[PDB]
Design a protein around this nucleic acid. Structure first.
Ligand SMILES: [Mg+2]
Ligand SMILES: [Mg+2]
Length: 80
RNA sequence: GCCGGCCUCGAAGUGGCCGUCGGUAAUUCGCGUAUUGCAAUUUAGACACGCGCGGGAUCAAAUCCUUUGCAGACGACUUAG
């Protein structure tokens, strides 16, 4: 499917050069361990104390305050 | 906290004990919270002020004008109507 294009630009589009910015895993703080009780500083559940379950890829955390203990469900938050 | 008796509070009007009426985890629980989607002021208060509801209360003055001369450049002022 390397056919001729239906349209051609007025002048050749400049391509960007290679960036050399490899993606490397985020390293969470030593205090972010599973089961740690954390206070939510912002968002809908600001001021709520929830339980950390897992650390996600790019500074995101999976937490749940026990929904029957406080009305926080399973939720993603930001480690910051 | 809400309203009611009262009793005392004059440096620029204060607090109280006596009652009503409400709400109230000191302990332990049972249901609800989710979807504001990974943060985005937590629009939440008391000072007002201007209003409209629908009532109570109340039914006033001032100036011009004329007049006086204890006054006066004109205003103003002292009077009287
Ligand atoms: Mg009671
Ligand atoms: Mg004279």
């Amino acid at each position: 499917s390397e056919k001729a294009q239906k349209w051609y630009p007025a002048e050749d589009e400049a391509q960007p050069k290679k960036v050399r910015k490899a993606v490397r895993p985020w390293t969470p703080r030593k205090s972010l361990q599973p089961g740690t009780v954390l206070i939510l500083l912002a968002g809908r559940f600001r001021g709520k104390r929830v339980v950390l379950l897992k650390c996600l890829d790019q500074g995101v955390l999976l937490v749940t305050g026990p929904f029957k203990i406080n009305g926080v469900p399973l939720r993603r938050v930001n480690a910051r």
